[PDB]
Design a binder for these strands. Sequence first.
RNA 1: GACCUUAUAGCUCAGUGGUAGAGCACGGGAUUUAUAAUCCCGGUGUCAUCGGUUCGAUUCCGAUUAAGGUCACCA
RNA 2: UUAAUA
RNA 3: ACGAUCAGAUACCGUCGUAGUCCUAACUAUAAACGAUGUCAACCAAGGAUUGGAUGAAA
RNA 4: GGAGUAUGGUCACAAGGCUGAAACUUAAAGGAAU
Lengths: 95, 133, 212
Amino acid sequence: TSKRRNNGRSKKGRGHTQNVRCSHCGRCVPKDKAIKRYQIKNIVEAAAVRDISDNSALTKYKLPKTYMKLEYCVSCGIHGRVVRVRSRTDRRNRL
Amino acid sequence: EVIPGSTKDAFGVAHIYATFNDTFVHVTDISGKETIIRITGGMRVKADRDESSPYAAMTAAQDVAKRCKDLGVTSLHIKMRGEGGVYSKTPGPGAQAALRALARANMKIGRIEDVTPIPTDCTKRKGGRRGRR
Amino acid sequence: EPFSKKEWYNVKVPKNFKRRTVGQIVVNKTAGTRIASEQLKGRVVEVNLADLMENEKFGAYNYKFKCEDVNGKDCLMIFHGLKLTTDKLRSIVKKWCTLIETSVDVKTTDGHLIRIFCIGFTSRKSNQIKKTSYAKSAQIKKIRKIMNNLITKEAASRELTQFVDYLRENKLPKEIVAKCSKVFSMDNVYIRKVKILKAGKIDSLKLLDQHQ
RNA sequence: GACCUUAUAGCUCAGUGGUAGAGCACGGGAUUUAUAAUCCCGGUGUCAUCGGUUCGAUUCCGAUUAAGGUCACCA
RNA sequence: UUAAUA
RNA sequence: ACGAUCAGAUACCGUCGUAGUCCUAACUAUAAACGAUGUCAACCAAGGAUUGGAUGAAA
RNA sequence: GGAGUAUGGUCACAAGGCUGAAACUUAAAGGAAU
């Protein structure tokens, strides 16, 4: 029956939550049920950082980063290896 | 002698718009209303599946670089961008290749910025409730 | 040849900034009923603040200028707006804190009508142990009313040109933090965008005062 | 009854004065545990039945059959 | 990319 | 309604697109309307944390 | 299983909603775990 005590959600004291769109499928998933991951990366890959820094017109300009929050449905979180299927006794670990 | 309309060391801004289905290299002036040279990844390929290849990005980027030096533009501002309207905001693979190609063409780079348009709030996304399958 | 008809004009920003020339803008040469000085009348130039001041402690601000006349191959610019850099705006949004946003419509002393946007964030404390730092709905409204009133006093009393140069000094963000700290712990206060809703009347002599 | 048109592989069709092409179907071989699908190869047409022009007719011209389409009205 | 049945 | 895929595809993929999606007034009264756990009341093992108060200390 | 089906009653502009069987058929259907 109940594979999870919380039913796979994060909703406890309410009846409805708004929807969000899967970043890969475009599916509609509720805000709590969606798999939310955060990403902070530089706009230049590790190979090209040296090339840009060589020929630059600015004194010591610091390369900016990009920040975006990605939300995945369950199907596209498992398939994209964002999350894995865990053991029956290891499902309970929340760290 | 000098190419008509060209000047000395000046500044331009490159609008690198690279999706997963194509890539754009587009340089304008500081105002942005005048374009110098616009080359896309689809003009340097034959089949339709290679317009997003990183190889097509540098080939288009080098052609942009060569023209700009001949026209007096020597340094560029980078405005990196992807199709981030309501869809994935991650720029395509050719975005980094084009920027690295411009650097390796001995072009001074000024400020680098990400100008993917993030909606303050969005219209309905294509696909439906259950999305792509 | 496409560029055979093109001309390059020098761009001049007002005297408020350390750097007076920011670049060159392109326009086609004149034609029958097409004068370049007439065509370079609505061009908006966007330049970083780390270039007009020649210091990189101003790097997270983009400034925009419009052209008001062509004075012999020179485009005399006037201030058109300011906006936080996209990387900076998304780099100051922490997760477990309350975000406070506001906007004010202020009429300057010299007649310009502008819109100013302010952002803020409830902060942690030195000895704070609990992870979250949220504010009640009463404290948010108290903070917003303070930063709404405080930003209006500093902006309405001064003209547009001198108010913009005031924004370069951190007095306003520092004063907001030092006056909202008696209600809640605030750390990051920035003016993310300034618009110009209604362009006030200007004169050539006033513009000449603005340009040397 | 009078006008018009058609008849080609086992089935639907193309093309047609010097050698009839397409599929679908059929036979054999390969893949499969086996079938289906898939790949390879092959065999298929009295060009509806008689006369004449025909260099030479399956094509052009008449005839005999079948098959269809239209008309068959005023009283 | 496609993968039906006993 | 097109275009692909397929043996076929009236589907999954792509393009266009009517009702609908939005607001006002009136109907309809159904959901995996779920905590699949009726409402009220008493007793009830160890904790750590959190939301809103009251009350001491620590500014 | 038949079946929330038929009929009867009632509500609705309609789709439908509420109430709601029987004949007949069948040794299992089902729940949690190894």
